Each structure stands twice: as C-alpha cells, then as structure tokens.
C-alpha cells in the first residue's frame with residue numbers, strides 16, 4: 132503493498 | 137513503456 | 142514464450158477502462174443489493190477482487206442471477222468504498238469508516254484490504 | 267477522496283484473475299471468429315483493450331451478438347498473440363510474427379502495440 136498515490 | 141519482464 | 146516484452150501500464154489502463162464502463166453502466170450484468178442500496182457491476186471484476194463473489198459466480202445456479210442480496214448487517218457505504226477499490230486500486234480509508242470497511246472486506250473475503258485495515262487499527266491502539 | 271491509499275499490485279492481480287477466468291472459460295460471453303479459428307473472451311476486456319471492440323460492443327445492435335466474425339485477411343496467430351497480450355500485458359513479438367501482429371493491432375486499434383511494432387521494424391531497417 133500500500134502506498135500514498 | 138515496454139520492458140523485458 | 143519466455144521472449145515476451147511487457148507493457149508496464151497495461152493492467153492499470155485496462156482497470157481504468159473497466160471503471161469507465163462501470164461509470165457509464167456499459168455491459169454491467171449484476172446488481173448488488175445492500176439494504177436499501179443498489180450497486181451495478183461486472184460479475185468478472187467482482188470475482189477477480191473477492192473470494193465471496195468468486196464462490197457465488199462460479200456456482201452453477203447463482204452464476205445466472207442478475208441480483209445478489211448481501212447480508213443485512215453489511216454497511217452500504219463500506220460496500221461502496223470496496224467496490225470503488227475493486228475498480229481503481231484506491232481505498233478511501235478514514236477513521237469514520239474503517240470499522241465498516243474492515244467488516245465488509247472480511248465478509249467479501251478481500252485479504253489485502255483486511256490486512257491494511259488491521260494494520261491501521263493496530264497503529265491507533 | 268484525495269486521502270485514498272493505493273494497492274500497487276491490484277490492477278495486475280485483477281488482470282491475472284480475468285486471464286484465469288478466460289483459461290477456465292468462466293463467464294466468457296463472446297466468440298471471436300478469425301477464419302477457421304474461434305476464440306472465447308470477455309466483451310469487457312476486449313473493449314478495454316481495443317478501439318475496434320470498444321466501437322463494436324457499444325453499438326446498440328452488435329452489443330447483443332455472441333459471435334463476431336473478423337475480416338478474413340486477419341491472421342489467427344496474430345489475433346491469438348494480441349488476445350494473450352490483452353489478458354496479460356505480455357506481447358510475444360518475434361521476427362516471424364511481427365508483420366501479422368502489427369497488421370492485426372492496426373485493425374483492432376491497439377495504439378501501444380502498433381507503436382512498439384513500428385519501433386522494432388524500424389530497428390531492423
């Protein structure tokens with residue numbers, strides 16, 4: 132996996 | 137885009 | 142062949158187009174009912190994203206239904222957020238919806254969503 | 267919301283599952299006929315990957331057909347390679363198939379495939 136897009 | 141996977 | 146080339150952005154471009162088809166209600170083939178609230182979708186995308194829908198639409202009798210009613214305990218907002226995640230890879234997780242999102246992801250059998258929900262809850266304890 | 271988190275591998279995981287549905291012939295809803303040769307697929311994936319299929323399946327009459335016959339000049343191997351690319355992001359481009367793949371991608375209106383085919387041909391001149 133999870134990221135800040 | 138195109139790459140060698 | 143082991144000599145294939147690969148277009149990096151292809152999978153994301155396909156998903157974007159499937160979400161545009163959903164927005165425009167094109168070739169949607171099922172209505173998911175969550176209490177009062179109806180959501181139109183593509184059976185293939187739902188199966189690709191959820192262990193629950195994969196079990197439902199591979200069943201010889203349920204594969205033919207055009208309406209699926211979810212358990213009345215399921216929150217329509219939680220379902221809506223998960224349906225958007227299925228079609229976009231983006232999860233709108235907020236303090237005010239995380240419990241409902243996690244309970245809905247457990248029901249829908251979406252393993253990766255459940256794991257991130259658990260991590261965010263554990264950080265808030 | 268602008269506060270979403272994103273699962274990086276989601277789009278690729280969805281595409282992998284759609285290709286597993288195709289392999290198992292699950293919820294496929296169209297047969298593409300290329301000369302002697304029949305290919306089963308999902309209309310949504312074909313529309314998501316091709317300007318030709320997007321035009322076909324958004325037409326009020328053709329959206330209902332369960333069989334689509336392609337122009338007899340289209341090579342079935344070229345179509346097969348492009349159908350695999352649609353469901354996997356991997357293109358099996360070889361000296362012996364590049365002309366047929368490019369002609370098929372031009373017909374199917376797959377812009378990114380046409381561009382790489384052109385680049386590989388230009389390098390061989």
Ligand SMILES: C[C@@H](O)CCn1c(=O)n(C)c2ccc(Nc3ccnc(Cl)c3C#N)cc21
Nearest residue numbers: 188189190192195250251252279283286287
């Ligand atoms: C996309 C990724 O996040 C995985 C989502 N997901 C989960 O979490 N479970 C438990 C699934 C269980 C099943 C599936 N769906 C499939 C699994 C096997 N083969 C095929 Cl063809 C499909 C389809 N369609 C997705 C699941």
Ligand SMILES: C[C@@H](O)CCn1c(=O)n(C)c2ccc(Nc3ccnc(Cl)c3C#N)cc21
Nearest residue numbers: 154158161162313314315317320375376377
């Ligand atoms: C996936 C990526 O490589 C693009 C593939 N492709 C091309 O090359 N053309 C010309 C397309 C022309 C159209 C499409 N498909 C769509 C375009 C607009 N809106 C929606 Cl909802 C879809 C669908 N489904 C894909 C095309």
